[PDB]
């Protein structure tokens, strides 16, 4: 039969899928996307650590003074007095007692009772998440796991604070809480494990995280370790064993090798699967391939190491990933600097790598403890950082104290060579790989294989034009906001960063805290000046907006006024600077073409031989088209209205925004209304000033709109209001409009009352997807109730505006957006909202001004709306941009140390 | 070594005796009975210095160079003796039903 | 179409293999083989825990007094004074200060500076390994890993430091060393991790262990938790926030729940893949199927629990396992029962398990903390132990304090049902399975699914007839040996016990230590009496043997005395009982038949027609056959020799043991020697006299017309029968003369040089192939290979003196220590002892023999093996009991002392 071939094909496909699944479950590569560190000597960034390693130097220094230690009797040259240490140098963090309690929502008492390791871990985790280009708030609710190497050191063991009803003294020192707090604050939902295996805890955590990622329990892993000493006991203990170097330098594979020098430090890395990293577009720095663990077993004492165990670890690690000894260029050794540990490690490395090795490509050997010292549990992953840096800049840092190699190790084989000086490691045809080793006091051993990341080609579509660019900065405090603004200004001042990249990075990679500020600029100098003005303290320029908000979402209400917002050049260049606006205008012109001859685009562009902005029949369609185009432009940025309110004929536009009507039907209705409006051009007169005040002076002559408590517009009649203009004489009738022969909402309206129905009696309204609270009736209807009779009633009945605004404010809406080429009812809306109970945090924002109308003005209005709570998708304003690299959050630190 | 051509047990016993004699002087006592071929050197009182000296005492015993960390790799007399000895010396449907 | 068919077959085989590999790497079941526990109230074994759970009871008690706490200033009724607690009841271990430092090779100072958690972990790990029927020394060098839940509790902080050059305190208080020390002492070579995640840590460890077992990193895992209080700090801190129950109880879901009661405890379980358990033969108790972990996330508080996280973790665990919520029969809930954990946990279980469940089979709830209280780190493992015990005994124990259920949740709606009263859980057609939950303070949750073991306990024989049985006991000290003997005697006093099973369990499922003892018995009363004699003190009974050893193995050397050990019968019953003996005797009859008429079996059985043990021509072949058969029997049980030495014609038998001569050639040689030696019988006699080599060498002067120098002063003959008669009284003062029954001839004498050609041509067909065992001849006093053992060499042996003293001394100085004489009677033991004593070699040589002239039974031969064994010779005892079921035996009887630190 011929069916066999399809069976063969399906079997081959299934076999391939099964093999791929086996490979994914067994040896799926893992990608490193970001890292963070805090190391002695003022090293707080990976770049600073790389600079220190390349220059060649140590962080050795004297004992700390602010920790409250008693340095007087602590030091004694004789290694026999109890409670004294003969060494007095080591690597210590510059500021280990600083913390920003308010940023993480921690009361000062809890922060004071909290171990410094937890505080530093929180800060470094936030910095690591920010460095990857990921919004920290986006990780909330995900499945990110945490794996840390942390051990207790005895912080706050001399304090007996009784008033601890909350119980801060217990959870503030517990090693499990060191990761529980990170998970709780960041909102992660992955496994949280705090391992502790001597000084190799970090690599064990890395192995566990790799296993968890390969299984699929977690999608991201925060791996690392921390070690901060709060008491001088550690040194004292080792001072009894004479295991500390007198000078304090840890000479790895050197002639002296009299001991090791301890140091503090916190280190973290972020791990994710390579395929998912490529899918999501995260940056990739290096690839972890394989790892292995074992036990020393029966050895020459509990603490002494064993060579065969190390050889077995190396062989297992090489075999697990499918590699072979000979594809590894360099090994980052343990190198504690002891008298006999270094010979053992070097002999194991020679046995496992040196044999059958090319005589032209020796294995480079070095360690990082010769520069920064042995950083307790965080040592292992720390070495990893070095390798990653060596894979980015392209050279191997040298190892100090090497000029006299240890005579115990026989270097005559040539398989392994020490890093006397820097060696170039540029990318080539040979894939670059490296190994990291860690061995602990307990006996657990770890070996990890890392490889260079794959290649990205261009990712270059800058096209830095003169388009406006918004810069949005945010922070949880005024001082923090000022520091952030200063940092961004300093970053922009350098002549190597584009505005589009900085804007996109600020918009899509940083969080959105309470205090917010925004600057819309087209040139680098303008942005720098605006940021400097923000950082100064006082904001004066209109291009700078600042605000404070306590929420993240608002109910947006679109409101459309009637007439009075006319200005020649509405938008203008805006038509050519925004595809959506031009497209909507063209659609409106196409819809209106089968009835007229002139085009709205010609009028907006001041084309010659076109009607001016003086006749109603041409003013109204222009206003309607501008209004609908502005609504579409607003919606294109991610702002979706929850209710629409129209004033007078503007209601029609609102209907089209509501979706109840269609573009053709709405255009035809507006055209018919304007045409009938033109005929009744003999009587009119709008006047502006309490309903009762108007009623008591309206009887002799035989009310159009109500905007507030003292804002009433009356009907139109030349003779009737000719006397009214002077009858008040008490600031009654002062504000007047042009309104040449309108007489809207007047008994003159029902004079015709039939041709409008005949012309507009062809609409086909449909149900709407958004509330359409009208003004003629204080109610919310649907499309099915919007007929020509309703429009006639709207033309006739009163269009009271204050009641609708008050009802919306009391209902729960708290964000009113004004959509018009010029704000005319913003003041009335603000007054009505303030007078009504509603909420005391409502924000009213306008649109293009009568003197602006440029895309810059629209972006400024959007920033004004955003700094108050409204969510806006800024990336739309920056198409085809490449995100940049920005400094992390500028924490404001205070001293929290438990003083004895 | 010059003394060769012996069964396995003879060489093993001779090397064990040599190791015990060498380590006895380092320990201090002049008898091999107190030295056990299973107890780790740490339990016998060996430190870092003396452990080196034993190697030297072995270096002159057999005239062959030994690693400076010989004791740590082989944490008993028997293992050291063994290391010294080693160095000195139709279908279509059902079969296709797996696919579904 | 043949190629297409073959390709399709290969592709489908590969597809099946790939699917099997995927399933094994994803959801391979794990088997629990053994457990160990140490809990408050004297509960030291799982059986005691099960008895306590089934009977119904608590373990609450007052605060400990020996720990050194200041009980006067610690307890205060007011929950407001600083440094005071308003509770005085809790679960505490009976003896947390006990430790056997000498057993683990730990100096007393290190033991004093060591945290009690590490000591209890070591003891429980040894007990756990022994409870699995596995030799603890066998695990040495394997890939076994350990995973522990442990946290620091502040031991030794109050006291000041001292001379700590070894740095004992730092390694004695660290948590990582707690798991490192187990691997260091037991010699394990697998990953060792000490996780710490609130009160669920232990369960978390279990999860990791599974991921280690399925991949292949570790073949076996030791998963557990430990929590022992050293200072009364936890009580004070938790009383400061009114978080403890007033009465100290831990009401799980009762309406009167107000807090949790803390307790100590150390628990451990042993994990291994089900396929490996099936292959190796380890007993399987339960099967772990799946597990899951997650985080509470951004809840309303750091310590407050969250229901959605628990529901998510339960559903994820069920999905990963591959089952439905309707298959789980019971749940071991967390059940802390402090303020509000019970409503949340009950609601989560009701919304997950109770949704759309059969009304006939409601889910069974329950918690173990209602009986023993909160155990901190060792919390999940205790629930696992309870679940496995319930599965094994087929009964669900009832939770306590459930008189009034909590009214904050809906019970009458349906689904979950509280476990008030014992409920049967007998095996049937439904697969019984349960779940265990653990939610920590830090915010990590764990849910594990366990199921019953497959039915495999219906394959046994329990065969026993009455054959002799050896019992071997050992320990590292005399007191421990006495306690072990007492324990075994008490076990054997129980009526429902099998002697063969106990013997096999002692032989195979237990380690060998320095002090050893052995008792061979074929009756229960005899074994009980022997064990009682051992445990009482000095035992002089013949069956009882004992000794002290220091070397694992030895260099056993076989000795063949030759003649002079004649005795009526040579293991008659042995011929009937042991099959190897009879087989070898029959094998050495086919080649012996052509040169005679009688049969060796008939002579040994005293059957009529046997020539009798008087004529040499029939004594020599019978002695050779008995010697070679006894050597072959010694070859069994694994006593492979390293050197063979003879004294007389028995050297021929030696030549057969080393493999130099085939059986036919040796039989021909011995038959020819006997024939053409008896032909000229009546020459003279031997008449060995113990005078000295120098004395006889200066004394034989009157008669020039020495056979053996085996002893330092022991000579046989020199001269003629008339010269022998003259020498018998010539001095009249040397004494100890004659003492020889061999009067029919006189070998090693000038009389030999008359039948040279006869022996040369009657034994000219020899094929002496090289020997696989070092042969040390006493004729040339040197070790030579078997390629030159020709007829000339045998004639020289007949006509040369035999040393048997230089050879023994050379062997002793060479390095050989154990000497075993293969003979039907010990005749040369004294000479070998004297030669060894005079030698300068190691003064620990062992000399044994074989059946005596009266004890020719298999029991006596096994007794000889036991005597050789207690001195350092490895013997495979399981051969002596072919076909048996190993029994269950008590663990090692540790001798404890006090190693606590006080200010």
XYZ file of N, CA and C in Angstrom, chain C residues 659-661 766-772 775 782 784-791 793:
63
model
N 47.853 -26.329 41.479
C 47.574 -26.552 40.079
C 48.758 -26.998 39.250
N 49.921 -27.213 39.869
C 51.089 -27.652 39.115
C 50.873 -29.033 38.513
N 50.256 -29.937 39.267
C 50.008 -31.299 38.823
C 48.513 -31.535 38.685
N 54.955 -37.548 33.635
C 54.583 -36.391 34.437
C 54.443 -35.187 33.516
N 53.386 -34.406 33.723
C 53.121 -33.197 32.944
C 52.954 -32.036 33.914
N 54.053 -31.537 34.478
C 53.984 -30.470 35.496
C 53.838 -29.073 34.898
N 52.594 -28.709 34.597
C 52.298 -27.391 34.066
C 52.516 -26.324 35.138
N 52.728 -25.069 34.731
C 52.954 -24.005 35.717
C 51.779 -23.850 36.670
N 52.100 -23.520 37.917
C 51.120 -23.393 38.983
C 50.680 -21.943 39.146
N 49.408 -21.766 39.499
C 48.833 -20.443 39.695
C 49.002 -19.921 41.116
N 54.296 -21.861 45.182
C 54.650 -23.126 45.812
C 56.019 -22.979 46.460
N 63.312 -23.114 48.969
C 63.116 -21.958 48.109
C 61.792 -22.108 47.376
N 59.794 -22.181 44.074
C 59.989 -22.448 42.660
C 58.646 -22.722 42.002
N 58.590 -22.475 40.696
C 57.381 -22.739 39.939
C 57.217 -24.240 39.710
N 56.065 -24.610 39.166
C 55.720 -25.998 38.953
C 56.149 -26.583 37.627
N 56.945 -25.864 36.839
C 57.345 -26.362 35.529
C 58.509 -27.342 35.587
N 59.121 -27.542 36.757
C 60.236 -28.472 36.897
C 59.963 -29.550 37.940
N 58.701 -29.744 38.322
C 58.336 -30.789 39.278
C 58.239 -32.126 38.541
N 59.408 -32.665 38.207
C 59.514 -33.916 37.478
C 59.736 -35.073 38.449
N 59.885 -36.277 37.889
C 60.099 -37.460 38.716
C 61.399 -37.368 39.502
N 62.614 -34.649 40.851
C 62.325 -33.842 42.031
C 61.611 -34.659 43.098
